[PDB]
Amino acid sequence: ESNLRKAFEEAEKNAPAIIFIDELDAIAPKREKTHGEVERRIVSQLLTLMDGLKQRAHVIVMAATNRPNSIDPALRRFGRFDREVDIGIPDATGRLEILQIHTKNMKLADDVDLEQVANETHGHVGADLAALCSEAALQAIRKKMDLIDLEDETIDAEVMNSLAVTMDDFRWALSQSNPSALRETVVEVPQVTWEDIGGLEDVKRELQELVQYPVEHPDKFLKFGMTPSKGVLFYGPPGCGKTLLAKAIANECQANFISIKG
Amino acid sequence: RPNRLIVDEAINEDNSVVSLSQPKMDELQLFRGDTVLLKGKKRREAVCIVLSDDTCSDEKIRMNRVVRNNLRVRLGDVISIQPCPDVKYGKRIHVLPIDDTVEGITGNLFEVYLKPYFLEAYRPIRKGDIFLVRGGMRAVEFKVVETDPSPYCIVAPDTVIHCEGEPIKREDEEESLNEVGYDDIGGCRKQLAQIKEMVELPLRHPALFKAIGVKPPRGILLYGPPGTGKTLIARAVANETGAFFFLINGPEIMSKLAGESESNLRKAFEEAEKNAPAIIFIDELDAIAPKREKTHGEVERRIVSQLLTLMDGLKQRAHVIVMAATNRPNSIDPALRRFGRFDREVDIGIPDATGRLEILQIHTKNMKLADDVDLEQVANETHGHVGADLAALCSEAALQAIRKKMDLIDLEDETIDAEVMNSLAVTMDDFRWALSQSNPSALRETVVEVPQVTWEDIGGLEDVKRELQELVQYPVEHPDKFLKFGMTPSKGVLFYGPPGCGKTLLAKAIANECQANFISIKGPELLTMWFGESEANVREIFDKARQAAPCVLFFDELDSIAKARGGNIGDGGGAADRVINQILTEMDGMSTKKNVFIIGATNRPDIIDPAILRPGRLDQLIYIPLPDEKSRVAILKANLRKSPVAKDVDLEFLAKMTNGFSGADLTEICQRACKLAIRESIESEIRRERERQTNPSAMEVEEDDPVPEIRRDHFEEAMRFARRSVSDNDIRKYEMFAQTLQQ
Amino acid sequence: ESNLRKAFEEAEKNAPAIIFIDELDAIAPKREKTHGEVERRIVSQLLTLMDGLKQRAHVIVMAATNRPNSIDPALRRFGRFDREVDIGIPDATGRLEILQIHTKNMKLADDVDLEQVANETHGHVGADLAALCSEAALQAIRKKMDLIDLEDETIDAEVMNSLAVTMDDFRWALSQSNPSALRETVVEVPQVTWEDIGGLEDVKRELQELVQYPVEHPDKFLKFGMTPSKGVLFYGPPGCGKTLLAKAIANECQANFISIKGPELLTMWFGESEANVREIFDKARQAAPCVLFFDELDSIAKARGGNIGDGGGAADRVINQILTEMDGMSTKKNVFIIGATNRPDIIDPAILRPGRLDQLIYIPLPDEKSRVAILKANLRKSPVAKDVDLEFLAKMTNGFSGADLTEICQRACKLAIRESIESEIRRERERQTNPSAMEVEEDDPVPEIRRDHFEEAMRFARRSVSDNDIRKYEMFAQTLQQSR
Ligand SMILES: Nc1ncnc2c1ncn2[C@@H]1O[C@H](COP(=O)(O)OP(=O)(O)O)[C@@H](O)[C@H]1O
Ligand SMILES: Nc1ncnc2c1ncn2[C@@H]1O[C@H](COP(=O)(O)OP(=O)(O)O)[C@@H](O)[C@H]1O
Ligand SMILES: Nc1ncnc2c1ncn2[C@@H]1O[C@H](COP(=O)(O)OP(=O)(O)O)[C@@H](O)[C@H]1O
Ligand SMILES: Nc1ncnc2c1ncn2[C@@H]1O[C@H](COP(=O)(O)OP(=O)(O)O)[C@@H](O)[C@H]1O
């Protein structure tokens, strides 16, 4: 508690300060999880300091947690942490931007297809991509260990600028790498277009009426009196094109898609 | 009472002088140069020097503006004056200037202003006094914050003063003890009325209550969802009656240090004992006194027992009232409910539509709204909100107005401060955005409120309305006749009929007519509470129905129990019987004193358990037939309000044609017609759209968009998709059951 | 522990004294709930101090607790707490006495009826009655703030003697008040007497035989060595008044009446079965003599036989616990057990065994003169007008049960209430236009329920008991008469 108090009182004097409580769930877990008494004292100290923060020099507190149900429920009353912003797993394009950010200094060979690797790899987060790139660089540099290996002065930039990391090193690094996300619900924009399906000409019209109009022209709906429909149920022979229809309408309406299986 | 005195303008301009009339002067036995205590509003004191004046009337006291600001009063108010002959000479004071008085002075205040004013002055001072000093060219305002002795001292030649320090603000943030009267609460009329009723006497007049010899209340519980404004209620009551509001916070008391926590709590109680009629507020009571089995360590038990002992130690003592706030009534240790401790329970619920409108009207006071705000719909589209959410909504609306405006390359010279708020306003789009980007916190809380469906919304059904108003209206409006004649009123009514005939409409209509609360327990929740939790949920729902009387508790889809019971599973039968049996046991425990009316509705009466249909329980059976003729016309008219009905056409033939149709079919037809009309309007708009793209500058003039042409043809095409919701054989089964009922 | 030791030591040296320990369970709970280590030390220290009272002085220790099962069972050996005294919730006469005691000081105007207030407050305890009186007094004071000068100092004397508390204040205090007992078993002598029952004289004789003689003159039974029957089982058509006979015989014997209904039994199927039944039998034994009543005894088999087959285990739980705690009972503490059921064929044969419920009494449907008797019974508290022939109504209603006749009796009074209110509304419609134009003085119409009310009630009616059920019971009775 002395450390917490010292941290807050030090941060409040330096003017527009931004405190960051990393790993919040480690010190303020769910109520029934705690067993001893020091944890209760620490949690109450944090709560009373948060309540005692009154305006000050515009100090702002951000806390990072894993899932928004492990922290104590008391840290959501008005005045305390109230705004929740999620950071989802990057999907499709996001992996491309992450890879292009990390593979900045290294001189890639002209045959490298970063887009293909981004499309192939899923269930990975930023740290996994960074580790993959690092392992690729080391794999590239090990096979050419005839450079100096003796000189106490580090390698001259000359030969070190003659390293073209190829697709083979990237594939090898991708092979021997275990992902971490895996079993996580995926929220993304499916890429299926209204050309993947060929038939169902009037079902397209029906879905268009049910979906697109409420978000385009709410004024006429609210004036005329109707409440817009909230659900649609599909039925027919097994297979056919139900899932493609759902993905296509989600793509056209430009909104996220969440799938739950039987 | 020869102490009340209306205020009046003063003759002389000296700060520490008030002019008194000779008759009162001799009546009160005052002399020249003495000191008296002046008490005003909002718990403000003042020390002055009595001066004689024949011009001033007896009822009027001559006093200047500085003392009026210090006492926070105005002309025509009443101020009590009391002699203060026990003044103690001071030894050291601290004086500081206000923020907006020393702009570009840069000099020593001791000699320029303090020395000329304080020489041979003998002016007494008190904490919180604001006084003005006249010198060369500026009116210097000074604040005295520290003195010895406090708060009474007199300036003497053998005294030391200090004026070294930063220019203090106007009043910092000390607005709470001046603001939050009854003008700052909305949508809590009944609870505030009850608190004022049961708290005014022990706090306003202690002497009479002592003389009578009756025990006052010693504890009040205010339980409700967080952010509904309980501490604000306590602050308003304490600040209005006049007391020593002394707040105790839960978490800070918990984690002070190891075993010294109870020392602080005992010190708080001791301080509150010595200091006049006071209110003690304990916030987050569940955080320090949870259930006994829940507690794991030993310090928590020590704290709980210390609280209990200090509570039971309030025998007589003084006029101290303890108020506590908690989230859930069952989360408190049941030991804190015995007589003598917290016994009176007051429920602060979620605000309703009118309450939301009142809260919004209160908060949007500093902001200068535009002439387009109609807060009625903004209030009525925010179901599931509390006070804090609405305050945050107003703040975000102001910030978004700033965003839509911005300090456009405006160099922040601090010059653009007042024209910021005095140039702007708010428009619908900002509030619609804030509503869109909002996080409600109530959601899953049972709502208690008077429904707004009236008798006109339903159509026909004269006999059923007559019977319901017979069974509900008479016993509550003329109970004397029943008591004198000696009869027991009926307690329940069961509705049975084909689905979609308008049972919940009728229940809400009678709830509106009776002007009583309404609670709805839908089928899915009832089916959920089988698997475990078959005692608790029923307990609190019945308790909530009882405490908020009058109300008409509604049980919908009562047959779902045995409907899910029958099947290929046969495992919810024990759950079914336990749920029905808690329902029955709680129903038989009702007392006629409370006007709690039970109504159950079902569409499959042949399956209901026969034990329900007994005297004392749900006994009367009322059959709702399918609408016919005039009922169909009435429901078609009821659904025909809308905004865009245009002039339209007759509705008689539509009612004449359909035979075997319920309300669901008519509402479906009404929705279909509007859907067709909207589709036509949008395709016409798209036609105009791509014809403008084909021909640029073709419609530079703003030609009117297509009107709401809800035509006969659109209606005839839309209702062409007419569906028969109900079959035919069910009518025969219902009528056979009805004929079985009659004998 | 120093405080406890000092307390007993100080009481030791100050003459015959009484030590009162309040909230005993808060310091000595069961050893299973004792989680820490300090509480075990406290309880052991208390036990040693208690056992150290050999001679010493004449010190008597009294303790108070809520749940008698919540105390550590170690505090029940001889030498320690051994005597058990139960303070129950007051009944109607007790409530009237409490109200009389707590209103001694105040001045009551000659309109309050304390009997009505006593009858309208079931479920309260003493503290609630005291709070009710206090709230009524405060309301009376607040209504008359004008007379009393609040001013600046003490009140006067004649003003206080001038205040009167009226019935309106009591009703207002009742409205804003919630009781505290509610969900508690009630042990009270019922108020129904013999005259409240129509017919059934032979059954009255049999019940009087099987309850009164063994308690009225136990000396003769001791001399002759008869073992009185422990239980009696009633069986017959529904709604013919079995509970009424039970309550009436309990009143005539002047013994406590404890009723257990079907809902409580089925709730105590799932989970809590042994503890509830044991507690019920313990409570029955403590307040002896009493007539314990079991109602809807057939609900066991009614719910057991269906499409579920999961409630049978707990049904056996309840029946087995009842048998176990019934056969091993002492009749010296008079506890007469009565069961009632309308589905006698499915009742478990183990119950119908000597030592258990053996005697079987059939309650017929009231017929002929019994109809006149019951209509006389139900028209003792209703101002029926003297123009209706009860004889023809009795002789028209062949094959009708008591509940049906009570419903018919109340229907006509409903018609009377609606007619009176309609007449009053019409009257208010008239004389609100002509100001006080009534040459003839007429009060509110006197209750004058005439023949047409009963004729209209009779037109729309019921025949609750079915004909096939009668012959089913007759066949069961003949089977019992012949096979057994
Ligand atoms: N244009 C199309 N029309 C119909 N079916 C298609 C089309 N394109 C692909 N399919 C096939 O239809 C199948 C849809 O079945 P699937 O989504 O697995 O389950 P569901 O029965 O829920 O649709 C896909 O496996 C896909 O191979
Ligand atoms: N009339 C009102 N009803 C409910 N809440 C209000 C009202 N007026 C203001 N509030 C909000 O209530 C807040 C203070 O209450 P709060 O401290 O949240 O109570 P609690 O601590 O019991 O949740 C203020 O920030 C204010 O925005
Ligand atoms: N008097 C009436 N007669 C027929 N239908 C009505 C009447 N009043 C309203 N309705 C319509 O019938 C519907 C009634 O639905 P609801 O009562 O919830 O179903 P249920 O009758 O199964 O409870 C409502 O949508 C309403 O628009
Ligand atoms: N003398 C009587 N004979 C039969 N029934 C009566 C008599 N007096 C009253 N009743 C009615 O019988 C009801 C009580 O019957 P009860 O003993 O519960 O039989 P069951 O257990 O079959 O329902 C009361 O509601 C009362 O209205």
Question: What is B461-521 written as a DSSP string?
Answer: -HHHHHHHHHHHHHHHH-HHHHHHHT-PPP-EEEEE-STTS-HHHHHHHHHHHHT-EEEEE
Residue B114 has what DSSP assignment?
A: I
CA distance to A262, C58, C104, C159, C424, per residue, from A249 (Å): 21, 91, 82, 83, 68
The strand pairing partners of B95, in sequence order, are B144
Q: Give one word for B276, left, alpha or beta, with left for phi > 0 and alpha for psi -120 to 50.
A: left
Helix (H) / strand (E) element for B139: namely strand B139-148
**What is the rounded distance in angstroms from the CA atom of residue B176 to the CA atom of residue B260?**
31
Angle between helices C402-431 and C369-378 (to 10 degrees): 40
Separation between Cα atoms, residue C368 and residue C244, nearest integer Å = 20
* Listed residue (B512, B494, B490) closest to B503, CA to CA: B494
In A116-253, which ranges are E strands? none
CA C414 distance to own-chain centroid: 28
Task: Let me know: does A94 contact A119? Beta carbons within 8 Å.
Answer: no
Residue C62 and residue B77: Cα distance in Å, rounded? Answer: 61
Pocket of ligand 2 contains residue A78 by CB under 6 Å: yes
* CA of C242, closest atom in ligand 4: 17
Beta-sheet pairing, B45-52 with B35-39:
antiparallel
Which chain A residues are within 8 Å of B287, Cβ to Cβ? 74
For helices B230-241 and B189-204, the axis angle rounded to 10 degrees is 40
CA distance C115 to B555: 37
Of A110, A107, A126, nearest to A118 (Cα)? A126
B299 contacts on A by Cβ (under 8 Å): 37
**Chain B nearest CA to C330, separation (Å):** 32
Q: Which residues of B touch C148 (CB under 8 A)?
A: 208
Q: Contact, B61 vs B7, CB < 8 A? A: yes
CB contact under 8 A, B578 and C270: yes
Pairing of strands B4-9, B60-63: parallel
Ligand-binding annotation for B459, yes or no, is no
Nearest neighbour of A78 by CB, restricted to B227, B287, B644: B227
> What is the four-CA torsion angle of B397, B403, B407, B408, rounded to 10 degrees?
-150
Ligand 1: distance of its center to the CA of A242 in Å? 7
Residue C355, annotated ligand binder? no
Query: What is the rounded CA–CA span in Å between residue C333 and residue C283?
Result: 12
Cα–Cα–Cα angle for B317, B318, B324, rounded to 5 degrees: 100
| Long-range contact set of residues B197-206: C-beta below 8 Å, sequence gap at least 24 | B198/B344, B199/B237, B199/B241, B199/B321, B200/B241, B201/C138, B201/C142, B202/B277, B202/B319, B202/B321, B203/B241, B203/B242, B203/B243, B203/B277, B203/B279, B203/B319, B203/B321, B204/B241, B204/B242, B205/C150, B206/B277, B206/B319
Measured distance CA(A193)–CA(A199) in Å, rounded: 13
CB contact under 8 A, B201 and C142: yes
Which chains sit next to B, with 3 or more Cβ pairs under 8 A? A, C
Question: Is C138's CB within 8 Å of B201's CB?
Answer: yes
Whether the CB-CB separation of B235 and B180 falls below 8 Å is answered with yes
Which residue is it, tokens 């520490």? B16
Distance from CA of C154 to the nearest CA of B (A): 6
Atom from ligand 2 closest to the CA of residue B390: 27
Tokens of B212: 């009578």
The Cα–Cα gap between B674 and B679 comes to 9
Chain C nearest C-alpha distance from B463 (Å): 15
Report d(CA C163, CA C383) in Å as an integer. Answer: 37
Using alpha carbons only, give the angle C237, C276, C334 rounded to the nearest 5 degrees.
70
Cα–Cα distance for residue pair B382/B352, rounded to 1 Å = 10
Report helix, strand or coil for B720: coil
- DSSP at B110: I
Q: How far apart are CA C94 and CA C106, in angstroms?
A: 20
| C195, C201, C240, best to mutate for ligand 4 pocket (most atoms within 8 Å of CB) | C240
For C8-77, give the DSSP string: HHHHHTSSSEEEEE-SGGGTS--TTT--SSHHHHHHHHHHHHHHT-SSSS-EEEEE--S-TTSS-GGGGS
**Are the C-beta atoms of residues B573 and C311 closer than 8 Å to each other?**
yes
Task: State the CB neighbour count (10 A cutoff) for residue B394.
Answer: 20
Q: B55-65: b or e for each residue (b if 16 or more CB lie within 10 Å)?
A: ebeeeebbbbe
Helix (H) or strand (E) holding A21: strand A18-21
A47 interface with B at CB cutoff 8 Å: yes
Backbone angles phi, psi at B163, to 5 degrees: -130, 35
Shortest Cα–Cα distance, A229 to chain B (Å): 10
* Collapsed DSSP state (helix, strand, coil) of residue A101: helix
Residue nearest to atom 23 of ligand 2 (CA): B227
Task: Please report which ligand is nearest the Cα atom of B388.
Answer: 2
Only one residue has tokens 């703030």, namely C145
Query: Which residues 25-44 on chain A approach chain B with CB closer than 8 angstroms?
Result: 35-37, 40-44
For the record, the structure tokens of C361 come out as 């009494």
SS3 B49: strand
Q: Whole-angstrom Cα distance, residue B131 to residue B67?
A: 8
Q: Which 3 state secondary structure label does DSSP give A163? A: coil
What sign has the CA pseudo-torsion C239, C245, C248, C254?
negative
C88 is in an annotated binding site: no
- Please tell me whether the peptide bond between B116 and the residue prior to it is cis, using omega within 30 degrees of 0: no
Return all residues near B696 (Cβ < 8 A) that are at least 6 apart: none
**CA-closest residue to ligand 3 atom 13:** B663
- What is the rounded CA–CA span in Å between residue C190 and residue C244? 10
Residue to substitute in B192, B232, B285, B286 for testing ligand 2 pocket (most ligand atoms within 8 angstroms of CB): B232
Q: Are B249 and A1 an interchain contact pair (Cβ–Cβ within 8 Å)?
A: no
Question: CB neighbours (10 Å) of residue B138?
Answer: 14
Cα of C232 to nearest chain B Cα, Å:
25
E-strand stretches of B211-263: 220-223, 246-248
Residue B654's contacts (CB-CB under 8 Å, 6 or more residues apart) are: B632, B636, B719
Of B606, B242, B680, C38, the residue nearest A224 (C-alpha): B680
Q: Which ligand has the minimum distance to the alpha carbon of residue B554?
A: 3
Measured between CA atoms, the residue of chain B closest to residue A55 is B173
Spatial contact of C372 and C394, defined as CB atoms under 8 Å apart: yes
| Token pair of B306 as six digits | 């210390």
CA gap A165, A162 in Å, rounded: 10
C133 assigned ligand-binding residue: no
Decide if A40 and B255 are in contact by the 8 Å CB cutoff.
yes
How far apart are the CA of C353 and the nearest CA of chain B, in angstroms?
A: 30
Which residue type does B468 have?
L
| Interface membership of A138 toward B (CB under 8 Å) | no
DSSP B150: S
Distance between CA atoms of residues C315 and C300, nearest Å: 6
Length of chain A: 262
The whole-angstrom distance between residue B16's C-alpha and the CA centroid of its chain comes to 44
Query: Determination technique for this PDB entry?
Result: cryo-EM
In degrees, rounded to 5, the angle at the alpha carbon of residue B600 between the alpha carbons of residues B596 and B606 is 150
How far is the C-alpha of B53 from the C-alpha of A105, rounded, in Å? 92
Here the tokens at position B204 are 């306003």
Beta C359-362 vs C256-260: how paired, if at all? unpaired
Q: Which atom of ligand 4 is nearest to the CA of C295?
A: 21
User: Do the Cβ atoms of B487 and C151 come within 8 Å?
Assistant: no
Q: 3-state DSSP helix/strand/coil percent for chain B, to nearest 5? A: 40, 15, 45
Q: Using a CB-CB distance cutoff of 8 angstroms, which residues of chain C are in contact with residue B201?
A: 138, 142
CA distance A27 to A23: 8
Distance, in Å, from the CA atom of B280 to the CA atom of B268, rounded to the nearest integer, reads 9
The answer to whether residues B400 and B451 touch, using CB atoms and an 8 Å cutoff, is no
- Smallest CA–CA distance, residue B439 to chain A, in Å, is 9
Contact B588, B542 (CB under 8 A): no
* Inter-chain CB proximity A45 and B249 less than 8 Å: no
How far does residue C246's CA lie from ligand 4's centre (Å)?
Answer: 11
Q: How far is CA C152 from CA B194, B200, B258, C147, C162, in A?
A: 26, 16, 48, 15, 21
**CB B350, CB B551: distance < 8 Å:** no
How far is the C-alpha of C371 from the C-alpha of C388, rounded, in Å? 15
Which atom from ligand 3 is nearest to the alpha carbon of B556? 23
DSSP class of residue B339 equals: B
Distance CA C466, CA B421 (A): 82
Here the tokens at position B451 are: 């429904």
Sequence-distant (6+) residues with CB within 8 A of C2 are none
Residues of B in contact with C24 (CB under 8 A): none
Q: Is B230 annotated as a binding residue?
A: yes
Pick from C338, C340, C352: nearest CA to C240: C340
Q: What is the number of the ligand 4 atom nearest to the C-alpha of C245?
A: 17
**CB C336, CB C291: distance < 8 Å:** yes
CB atoms within 10 A of CB C425: 10
Residue with tokens 């009997």: C115
Using alpha carbons only, what angle is made at residue A78 by residues A75 and A84, rounded to the nearest 5 degrees? 65
> Can you name the residues that pair with B623 across neighbouring β-strands?
B496
Residues B380, B353: contact at Cβ < 8 Å? yes
CA angle, C230 then C233 then C239, to 5°:
145
Q: Tell which residue, B244, B322, B236, has the closest CA to residue B278.
A: B244
Chain A touched by B225 (CB under 8 Å): no
Angle CA B574–B579–B580, to nearest 5: 100
Structure tokens at B21: 């009339």
The 10 Å Cβ neighbour count of residue C471 is: 10
Going by C-alpha positions, the residue among C212, C207, C413 that lies closest to residue B490 is C413
Among B376, B523, B389, B386, residue whose Cα is nearest residue B452: B376
Spatial separation of the C-alpha atoms in residues B140 and B98, rounded to whole Å: 8
Touching C: which chains, 3+ CB pairs < 8 A? Answer: B
C-beta of residue B355 within 8 angstroms of C-beta of residue B188: yes
Structure tokens at B187: 């949508």
Strand order in the sheet with B160-162: B130-134, B139-148, B92-97, B160-162
C-alpha angle B354/B356/B360, rounded to 5°?
A: 120
> Environment class of residue A35 by beta-carbon count within 10 Å: exposed (0-12), middle (13-18) or buried (19+)?
exposed
Q: Which residues of C touch B574 (CB under 8 A)?
A: 269-270, 308, 310-311, 314
C332 annotated as ligand-binding: no
Which 3-state string (H, E, C) describes B617-673?
CCCEEEECCCCCCHHHHHHHHHHCCCCCCCCCCCCHHHHHHCCCCCHHHHHHHHHHH
**Interchain CB distance below 8 Å, B573 and C308:** yes
Q: Are C407 and C458 in contact (CB under 8 A)?
A: no
| 3-class DSSP assignment, residue C323 | helix
The tokens describing B596, both together, are 């709690």
User: Which among C151, C382, C414 is the nearest to B486, CB-wise?
Assistant: C382
Distance of CA B130 to the CA centre of its chain: 36
- B-facing residues of C in 396-455 (CB < 8 A) are 403, 407, 410, 413-414, 416-418, 420-421, 447
How far is it, in rounded angstroms, from Cα A232 to Cα A245? 12
End-to-end CA distance of chain C: 68
Residue C296 CA: which ligand 4 atom is closest?
Answer: 21
CA–CA separation, A29 and A64 (whole Å): 13
End-to-end, the C-alpha distance of chain B in Å comes to 77
Hey, which bits of C285-326 come out as E strands?
Answer: 290-294
Distances (CA, A) of B188 to A236, B324, B514: 54, 18, 21
- The kind and range of the H/E element at B51 are strand B45-52
Phi-psi region of B557 (alpha: psi -120 to 50; beta: other; left: phi over 0): left
Whole-number Å distance between alpha carbons of B325 and B248: 11
Q: Report whether B505 belongs to an annotated binding site.
A: yes
Q: Which helix (H) or strand (E) holds A61?
A: strand A60-63
Nearest to C413 by CA among C424, C401, C403, C421: C421
Output the CA angle A92-A98-A99, nearest 5 degrees: 95
Residue type, C37: E
- What does chain B come to in residues? 743
